[PDB]
Structure 1
């Protein structure tokens, strides 16, 4: 037998900094989600359908992404905060307009916010990775996914 004795083995808990870094990624993921739906509903113009559908896909990814980070925070004993007031006050994403926007302006607007969201993740990467690699892999999924969304969307307005 190589069995341990301990009857109260605890789990890995994150430092205050780690939790704060994930909280930063959470509010931006939620803000991207909210802006994503906004764009999804108010976009109009050439190739409306394509963008209308792609935006919902980006939202699906953002929502499952935010849930993953939030639950990951819970796992490491951190407490996430995704309430509306908190998101609006702490998000680093540029405010999205409130009215109808042409497909061309939606492509640029959202592409910018996806990138803003990816910059947050790339900014906290090295710190969350140094403390917990396993969490860094989740961020890699977010980065790859979001950046792929950016590509799919931005390509609509490309030169040649």
Structure 2
């Protein structure tokens, strides 16, 4: 009646520009998760425990985020690259330093790393939204969740 008369109906394909934009998001989410864990292990000093715990919650969110983005790429037949060499070579996040770091330092360092990750998402959002609003909605959820983490972490160092 209103049934389409075709046996091969094409799905929505992402352009390579689109795929590349999500690839930028992906590497930063992965880097953030790797840096978050480094901080989680090596944070020491006043209010260690809270930061130790909040950092795991950040890592959980970023890990779920990176899976979401990579699988959205695959859904649109783009192909993600989350390999270590690629992440190290292409991430926009400032390097996390080595060794034990005080809670105060870790708060400042991680807040910056989150903000860099959010910046990447905000930078590609318009171009992503223009091609596929559904992907932009996922990016928006990441912005929301990550900016929450930044507030929850940075507030420790806030003086009023």
* Structure-2-length-normalised TM-score: 0.99
Instruction: Determine the structure 2 residue equivalent to 1:140.
Output: 140
Q: For residues 50 and 151 of structure 2, what CA distance do their matches in structure 1 show?
A: 14
* 1:115-150 deviations in Å (ceiling 9; x for gaps): 000000000000000000000000000000000000
Q: Tell me, which stretches of 5 or more residues in structure 2 are unaligned?
A: none
Shift of 1:75: 0.4
1:98 Cα shift? 1.2
Give the match's secondary structure for 1:97: coil
CA RMSD of aligned residues (A): 0.3
Partner of 1:41: helix, strand, or coil?
helix
The CA distance in 2 between the partners of 1:11 and 1:63, in whole Å, is: 27
Give a deviation string over 1:45-86, Cα, whole Å, max 9, x none.
000000000000000000000000000000001000000000
Tell me how far apart the structure 1 counterparts of residues 11 and 76 of structure 2 sit (CA, whole Å).
7
Which runs of structure 1 show a deviation greater than 3 angstroms over 4 or more consecutive aligned residues?
Answer: none
Question: What is the distance in 1 between the residues matched to 2:153 and 2:11?
Answer: 41
Displacement of 1:102 in angstroms is 0.1
Total equivalences in the alignment:
160
Question: How far 1:159 sits from its partner (Å)?
Answer: 1.1
1:159 match: secondary structure: coil
* TM-score when normalising by structure 1: 0.99
1:116 aligns with 2:121: no
